[PDB]
Amino acid sequence: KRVDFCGKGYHLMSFPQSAPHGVVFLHVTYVPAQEKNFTTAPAICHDGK
Amino acid sequence: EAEVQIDRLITGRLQSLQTYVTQQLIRAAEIRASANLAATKMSECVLGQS
Incomplete structure (x- = not known):
């Protein structure tokens, strides 16, 4: 849940791989794109509620 | 004698x-x-929530 510990962006999973004198991680990450703009409002009251 | 003195200094x-x-x-x-x-x-306590 901690951000940017392993991987960049939102994290899904990782895969380990061996090395001569180390280890290599493959992080899978989720990234939003193709944004749009909208108008918002905090809360809507109907019939006084 | 200079060699001895300078050797002591160097060591x-x-x-x-x-x-x-x-x-x-x-x-x-x-x-x-x-x-x-x-x-x-900084990376975890700023760009998100702990």
Whole structure:
């Protein structure tokens, strides 16, 4: 849940791989794109509620 | 006699330099650990929520 510990962006999973004198991680990450703009409002009251 | 005197001078100064270098290495390692902690804290306690 901690951000940017392993991987960049939102994290899904990782895969380990061996090395001569180390280890290599493959992080899978989720990234939003193709944004749009909208108008918002905090809360809507109907019939006084 | 000059060779003997300068040999004593050289060995003493070399020992002093060795001591200084070792102390600098130790302090550098400790500072590196502290800065790694600071980097993790900044990355996780600012760009998100803990």
